[PDB]
Amino acid sequence: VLTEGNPRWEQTHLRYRIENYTPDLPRADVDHAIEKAFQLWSDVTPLTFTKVSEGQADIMISFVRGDHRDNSPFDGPGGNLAHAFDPGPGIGGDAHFDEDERWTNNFREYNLHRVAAHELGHSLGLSHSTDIGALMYPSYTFSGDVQLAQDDIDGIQAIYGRSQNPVQ
Ligand SMILES: CC(C)C[C@H](N[C@H](CCNC(=O)OCc1ccccc1)C(=O)O)C(=O)N[C@@H](Cc1ccccc1)C(=O)NCCN1CCOCC1
Ligand SMILES: [Ca+2]
Ligand SMILES: [Zn+2]
Ligand SMILES: [Zn+2]
């Protein structure tokens, strides 16, 4: 079961920029994990996201460590892995990834795509789920696959509406 709060982007076409990259995995793997995480939400709602190299983007992603000037510092390896801000200007919608963690793209601890998809749901306005199988559950889990559970479909669609088009 979810628990939704309030703020939500009053525009269906957002833009995002990936400020920097983890030296842990190739640039293309980072770009693609982020892209694929956005693609999940886009599959069930009328939202659209566009990667931007520069200019004003709505969602700014960055890998940071410890105190990164936003009043909520990271803790090093383990524990807090990342965090995103709910819809709004400035840091609203932004997502920071704890650089102290090793970011992977497989079963090895801390699959970037699995954490990014979770965080980005926050940037859209999603609260957490109680359902241990949903994507918005409060702690990291990797079934080997990352697809929205009913809880996630329901929570996000309640805010933005459902898609018209099928999926794949
Ligand atoms: C679900 C995850 C993919 C993401 C999750 N990230 C955040 C955690 C809260 N971080 C955070 O910084 O919260 C306050 C905040 C929120 C927004 C902006 C600024 C500040 C979230 O999704 O709400 C996380 O780091 N969770 C940690 C656990 C944790 C939770 C909150 C705070 C600190 C640690 C985790 O799963 N880490 C995996 C290891 N463990 C640790 C022990 O329990 C079993 C899981
Ligand atoms: Ca950490
Ligand atoms: Zn931060
Ligand atoms: Zn969360």
Smallest CA-to-CA distance from 58 within 20, 21, 8 is with: 8
Smallest CA-to-CA distance from 105 within 19, 26, 4 is with: 26
Residue closest by Cα to atom 21 of ligand 1: 83
Q: What is the DSSP letter of 11?
A: -
CATH number of 1-168: 3.40.390.10
Residue 3 CA to residue 112 CA, distance in Å, equals 25
Smallest CA-to-CA distance from 138 within 154, 156, 151, 157 is with: 151
Pocket test for ligand 1, best of 65, 69, 81 (most atoms within 8 A of CB): 81
List the structure tokens of 136: 């918005």
Method: X-ray
Q: Which residues contact 71 (CB under 8 A, 6 or more apart)?
A: none
Q: Which one from 4, 10, 109, 119 is the annotated catalytic residue?
A: 119
Strand partners, 14: 49
Burial level of 137, CB count in 10 A (0-12/13-18/19+)?
middle
Smallest CA-to-CA distance from 114 within 74, 138, 76, 147 is with: 147
Strand partners, 17: 60
The sheet with strand 13-18 has its strands ordered as 48-51, 13-18, 59-64, 95-98, 82-84
Q: Ligand 1: which residues within 6 Å by Cβ?
A: 72, 79-83, 85, 115, 118, 138-140
List the structure tokens of 32: 């693609």
Residue 43 CA to residue 53 CA, distance in Å, equals 24
Residue 115 alpha carbon, nearest atom of ligand 1: 3
Identify whether 119 is a catalytic site residue: yes
Residues 83 and 96 sit within 8 Å (Cβ to Cβ): yes
